[PDB]
Amino acid sequence: SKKGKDGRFVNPWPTWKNPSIPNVLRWLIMEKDHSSVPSSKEELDKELPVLKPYFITNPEEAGVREAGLRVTWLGHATVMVEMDELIFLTDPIFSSRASPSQYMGPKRFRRSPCTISELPPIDAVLISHNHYDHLDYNSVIALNERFGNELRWFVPLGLLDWMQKCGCENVIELDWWEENCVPGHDKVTFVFTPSQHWCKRTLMDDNKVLWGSWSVLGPWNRFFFAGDTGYCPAFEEIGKRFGPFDLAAIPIGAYEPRWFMKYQHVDPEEAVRIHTDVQTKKSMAIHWGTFALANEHYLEPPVKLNEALERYGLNAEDFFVLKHGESRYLNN
Amino acid sequence: KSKKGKDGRFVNPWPTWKNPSIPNVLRWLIMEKDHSSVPSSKEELDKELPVLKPYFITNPEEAGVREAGLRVTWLGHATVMVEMDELIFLTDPIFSSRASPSQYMGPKRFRRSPCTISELPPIDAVLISHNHYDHLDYNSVIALNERFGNELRWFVPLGLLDWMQKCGCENVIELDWWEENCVPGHDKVTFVFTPSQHWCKRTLMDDNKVLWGSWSVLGPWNRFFFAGDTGYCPAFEEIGKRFGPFDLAAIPIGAYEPRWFMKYQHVDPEEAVRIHTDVQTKKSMAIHWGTFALANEHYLEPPVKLNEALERYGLNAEDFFVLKHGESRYLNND
Ligand SMILES: C[C@H](CCC(=O)O)[C@H]1CC[C@H]2[C@@H]3CC[C@@H]4C[C@H](O)CC[C@]4(C)[C@H]3C[C@H](O)[C@]12C
Ligand SMILES: C[C@H](CCC(=O)O)[C@H]1CC[C@H]2[C@@H]3CC[C@@H]4C[C@H](O)CC[C@]4(C)[C@H]3C[C@H](O)[C@]12C
Ligand SMILES: C[C@H](CCC(=O)O)[C@H]1CC[C@H]2[C@@H]3CC[C@@H]4C[C@H](O)CC[C@]4(C)[C@H]3C[C@H](O)[C@]12C
Ligand SMILES: C[C@H](CCC(=O)O)[C@H]1CC[C@H]2[C@@H]3CC[C@@H]4C[C@H](O)CC[C@]4(C)[C@H]3C[C@H](O)[C@]12C
Ligand SMILES: C[C@H](CCC(=O)O)[C@H]1CC[C@H]2[C@@H]3CC[C@@H]4C[C@H](O)CC[C@]4(C)[C@H]3C[C@H](O)[C@]12C
Ligand SMILES: C[C@H](CCC(=O)O)[C@H]1CC[C@H]2[C@@H]3CC[C@@H]4C[C@H](O)CC[C@]4(C)[C@H]3C[C@H](O)[C@]12C
Ligand SMILES: C[C@H](CCC(=O)O)[C@H]1CC[C@H]2[C@@H]3CC[C@@H]4C[C@H](O)CC[C@]4(C)[C@H]3C[C@H](O)[C@]12C
Ligand SMILES: C[C@H](CCC(=O)O)[C@H]1CC[C@H]2[C@@H]3CC[C@@H]4C[C@H](O)CC[C@]4(C)[C@H]3C[C@H](O)[C@]12C
Ligand SMILES: C[C@H](CCC(=O)O)[C@H]1CC[C@H]2[C@@H]3CC[C@@H]4C[C@H](O)CC[C@]4(C)[C@H]3C[C@H](O)[C@]12C
Ligand SMILES: C[C@H](CCC(=O)O)[C@H]1CC[C@H]2[C@@H]3CC[C@@H]4C[C@H](O)CC[C@]4(C)[C@H]3C[C@H](O)[C@]12C
Ligand SMILES: Cc1ncc(COP(=O)(O)O)c(C=O)c1O
Ligand SMILES: [Zn+2]
Ligand SMILES: [Zn+2]
Ligand SMILES: [Zn+2]
Ligand SMILES: [Zn+2]
Numbered sequence: 001s002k003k004g005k006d007g008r009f010v011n012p013w014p015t016w017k018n019p020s021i022p023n024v025l026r027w028l029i030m031e032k033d034h035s036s037v038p039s040s041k042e043e044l045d046k047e048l049p050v051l052k053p054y055f056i057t058n059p060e061e062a063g064v065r066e067a068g069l070r071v072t073w074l075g076h077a078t079v080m081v082e083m084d085e086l087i088f089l090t091d092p093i094f095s096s097r098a099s100p101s102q103y104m105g106p107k108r109f110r111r112s113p114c115t116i117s118e119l120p121p122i123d124a125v126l127i128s129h130n131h132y133d134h135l136d137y138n139s140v141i142a143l144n145e146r147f148g149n150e151l152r153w154f155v156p157l158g159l160l161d162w163m164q165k166c167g168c169e170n171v172i173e174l175d176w177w178e179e180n181c182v183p184g185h186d187k188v189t190f191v192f193t194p195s196q197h198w199c200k201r202t203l204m205d206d207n208k209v210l211w212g213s214w215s216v217l218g219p220w221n222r223f224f225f226a227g228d229t230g231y232c233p234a235f236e237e238i239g240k241r242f243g244p245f246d247l248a249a250i251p252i253g254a255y256e257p258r259w260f261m262k263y264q265h266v267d268p269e270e271a272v273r274i275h276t277d278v279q280t281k282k283s284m285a286i287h288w289g290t291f292a293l294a295n296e297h298y299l300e301p302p303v304k305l306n307e308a309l310e311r312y313g314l315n316a317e318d319f320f321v322l323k324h325g326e327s328r329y330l331n332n
Numbered sequence: 333k334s335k336k337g338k339d340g341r342f343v344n345p346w347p348t349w350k351n352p353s354i355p356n357v358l359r360w361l362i363m364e365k366d367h368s369s370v371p372s373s374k375e376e377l378d379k380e381l382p383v384l385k386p387y388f389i390t391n392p393e394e395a396g397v398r399e400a401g402l403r404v405t406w407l408g409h410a411t412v413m414v415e416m417d418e419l420i421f422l423t424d425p426i427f428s429s430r431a432s433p434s435q436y437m438g439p440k441r442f443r444r445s446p447c448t449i450s451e452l453p454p455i456d457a458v459l460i461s462h463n464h465y466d467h468l469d470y471n472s473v474i475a476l477n478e479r480f481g482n483e484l485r486w487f488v489p490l491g492l493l494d495w496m497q498k499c500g501c502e503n504v505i506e507l508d509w510w511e512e513n514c515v516p517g518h519d520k521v522t523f524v525f526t527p528s529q530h531w532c533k534r535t536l537m538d539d540n541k542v543l544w545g546s547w548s549v550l551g552p553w554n555r556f557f558f559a560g561d562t563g564y565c566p567a568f569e570e571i572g573k574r575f576g577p578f579d580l581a582a583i584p585i586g587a588y589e590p591r592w593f594m595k596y597q598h599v600d601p602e603e604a605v606r607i608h609t610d611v612q613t614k615k616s617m618a619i620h621w622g623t624f625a626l627a628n629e630h631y632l633e634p635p636v637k638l639n640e641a642l643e644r645y646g647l648n649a650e651d652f653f654v655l656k657h658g659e660s661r662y663l664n665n666d
Contacts, residue, residue, distance in 0.1 A: 041450050041479075095429070095435075096428075096471065097435075097471075100435070101435070102428075102430075102432075102433070102434065102435045102470065102471065103470060107471075111448070115444065117374040137435065137436060138429070138430075138435060
């Protein structure tokens with residue numbers, strides 16, 4: 001290739017990135033209050049409405065094995081992408097709290113639109129990093145319970161065990177810049193792409209499992225999942241090696257306070273930049289709207305995104321935000 | 333001051349004063365509670381145990397009682413919403429997927445919750461029978477006290493007040509056997525903590541620190557008994573005679589498999605109908621069962637055994653009915 005890879009430090013995984021500036025802790029004894037201010041049932045329902053998905057009232061449809069691409073936002077980074085036959089899910093979280101505990105931790109103010117049961121045949125599942133807001137043991141458990149060997153768990157290096165331990169066999173571990181495929185539908189290609197984030201689920205396990213983005217290269221359309229990352233070259237590299245991608249899921253939340261999050265989390269503007277670097281035709285906007293993992297107003301990220309869109313000479317068509325549970329079909 | 337089984341405190345914690353109790357407990361361990369019922373694909377359970385969408389979701393109005401009657405809605409396990417005398421009170425609210433102190437281990441419901449805390453009408457009081465994780469849900473407590481405030485009057489047994497306050501609740505009332513209180517505004521309704529034969533445990537060495545029991549709400553139009561968790565005991569004739577006749581009775585009819593083991597903490601359907609006769613209620617509702625797997629019996633068995641015991645005693649399904657998850661039922665009185 002020609003795009004820097006990694007390449008771990010003496011012991012754990014470094015980002016190898018320049019925008020990488022230390023600062024890595026937790027959320028129980030530091031800048032962790034908020035300014036989002038979420039309250040009032042009807043108010044939430046109004047501002048942030050939860051849409052009942054289609055694969056519930058009319059499962060039939062599904063498939064989208066046509067030639068375009070259908071996407072559904074089930075919260076935070078939980079997006080179901082119906083593309084080139086395959087029906088894959090990303091960073092699946094269907095539980096109320098994203099904490100190792102049930103007594104403390106972040107609880108969603110906007111519940112998961114559907115339930116794993118209601119879910120349609122899930123083919124592959126993609127995992128950005130190990131953070132609880134992206135890895136929900138309960139969710140994982142259910143998935144295999146329902147499906148099982150027929151679930152291509154595409155995971156980053158350092159997760160296999162966890163998966164297998166949870167009770168999964170169809171699991172692939174990958175170092176960013178690696179590649180693998182869904183057995184049956186081998187035509188489509190999945191690639192672990194780099195990113196700028198951290199990995200931690202317990203103590204001392206810091207950056208023990210790699211982080212990164214996913215790039216689904218399918219015969220017809222192409223999709224890119226960033227996950228959680230701060231602005232770092234890679235993106236362009238990706239947009240070059242692969243791309244032009246069709247749709248891309250870019251995080252637009254958890255950015256304030258900038259002085260601390262900047263290096264681990266992009267800002268709505270930085271996202272617009274990714275839209276460009278990755279060379280996609282459109283973007284869906286992941287993270288935001290579901291959990292309060294920062295101090296930014298919970299409604300701010302879409303406003304800041306449209307601000308940056310108009311700054312960069314773009315339009316809300318190019319980088320759109322879905323409603324909780326909404327689907328969207330893009331036939332190119 | 334008639335013969336009234338009072339407490340009920342031995343060594344340090346409370347024992348069950350009732351004669352038929354024998355402590356040889358072992359604690360919930362999936363061992364004999366994981367699957368001897370073996371619930372298959374959701375679909376199967378959708379056919380057998382359909383989850384309904386409670387009335388107050390589609391019609392948030394209509395949710396009082398207009399008096400001269402009694403409305404009840406079954407939300408899972410032992411969660412029961414009772415409306416009477418300008419009062420909507422909950423019992424044993426569990427709206428969480430798993431009934432455990434952990435998120436990695438414990439019994440997880442196979443039937444989703446009918447509604448959510450955001451969707452239910454104004455609750456005026458919650459009743460807690462005992463402290464077990466299938467009847468006391470931390471997240472549910474929080475959610476409730478987050479929606480509501482000092483308007484939610486939490487009626488809990490003796491030894492729970494501190495727990496409640498530590499959750500953030502301020503309008504909390506602690507009661508002992510045959511103890512009575514009321515909702516601040518509505519005085520005519522009187523809530524009474526009445527005996528039962530169960531145990532209490534959430535952590536290690538806290539066994540029987542808090543007390544168990546049953547609730548007898550005496551409103552000026554409709555008397556409502558709610559049993560909670562219990563094996564058969566004589567305190568139910570006391571409850572049924574002192575108060576009563578009652579209009580409804582939320583009786584448990586599930587989790588009774590290793591009769592040798594669970595007979596002193598959990599009634600079977602036969603003892604459940606025995607309960608119905610004892611408390612002298614006009615109607616009774618089947619609670620517990622169908623939601624969690626807390627024993628080995630087949631998950632559909634308890635209603636069948638309920639009907640068998642009903643016809644044994646010369647009663648029809650009218651007197652003792654089982655509802656679907658989320659179904660409601662209205663009961664007008666003389
Ligand atoms: C503040 C209490 C203890 C209070 C005391 O000193 O008595 C301490 C005890 C254990 C500490 C936690 C251990 C894990 C983490 C270590 C980090 O470095 C900061 C965040 C976390 C999540 C800590 C939060 C906080 O620093 C805690 C909860
Ligand atoms: C729940 C127990 C004990 C309750 C009791 O004995 O009454 C208490 C005792 C010590 C408490 C911990 C002290 C350190 C931390 C302090 C924070 O403010 C909340 C999180 C932690 C990690 C606490 C969690 C929890 O509140 C603990 C473990
Ligand atoms: C056992 C009680 C719950 C008792 C109850 O619900 O009444 C719970 C409540 C708070 C829980 C603690 C929260 C902080 C920690 C989180 C970790 O994930 C595991 C260890 C700790 C220290 C937990 C230990 C244990 O899980 C506690 C103490
Ligand atoms: C303890 C239960 C199983 C108990 C039983 O069979 O009854 C097991 C089953 C799945 C196990 C988890 C699998 C994923 C993780 C593997 C890690 O290396 C340790 C932590 C986790 C989160 C494990 C913790 C724990 O060991 C669990 C929850
Ligand atoms: C609290 C027990 C102590 C009991 C024992 O020694 O068995 C210790 C011992 C083994 C410990 C685990 C070892 C594997 C992991 C190492 C991480 O760096 C911290 C989290 C994990 C998941 C640990 C969690 C916790 O710190 C455990 C469970
Ligand atoms: C099975 C392990 C350890 C066995 C070993 O070390 O080989 C033991 C050690 C700690 C034990 C638990 C302690 C807490 C609880 C005490 C109850 O009175 C019985 C259920 C529980 C939940 C116990 C279940 C089980 O007995 C455990 C988990
Ligand atoms: C911290 C990991 C989760 C790690 C992951 O998700 O990968 C979890 C997985 C299993 C969890 C333990 C389960 C058994 C115990 C339950 C008690 O109620 C509190 C202490 C213990 C010992 C728990 C502590 C902590 O909650 C653990 C060790
Ligand atoms: C999660 C850690 C270790 C993780 C690791 O070393 O990678 C493991 C190590 C020891 C494990 C415990 C051993 C005793 C128990 C055995 C049971 O069969 C499941 C529950 C308990 C309470 C276990 C819960 C949990 O699974 C622990 C605490
Ligand atoms: C430690 C958190 C709050 C931490 C924070 O500030 O975020 C507190 C807030 C409410 C606390 C719980 C209140 C009910 C219980 C009281 C018991 O005496 C100890 C266990 C429980 C389950 C407590 C565990 C723990 O002490 C919690 C969960
Ligand atoms: C080790 C700390 C602190 C010791 C102290 O305050 O002296 C203590 C303080 C409170 C203790 C917890 C309180 C709630 C529970 C009490 C149970 O009966 C045993 C398990 C738990 C979960 C306890 C475990 C542990 O023993 C804790 C967390
Ligand atoms: C794992 C888990 N915990 C808790 C809940 C319920 O959330 P809450 O108790 O906050 O209402 C769910 C609901 O689906 C869940 O999946
Ligand atoms: Zn993250
Ligand atoms: Zn995140
Ligand atoms: Zn119980
Ligand atoms: Zn029970």
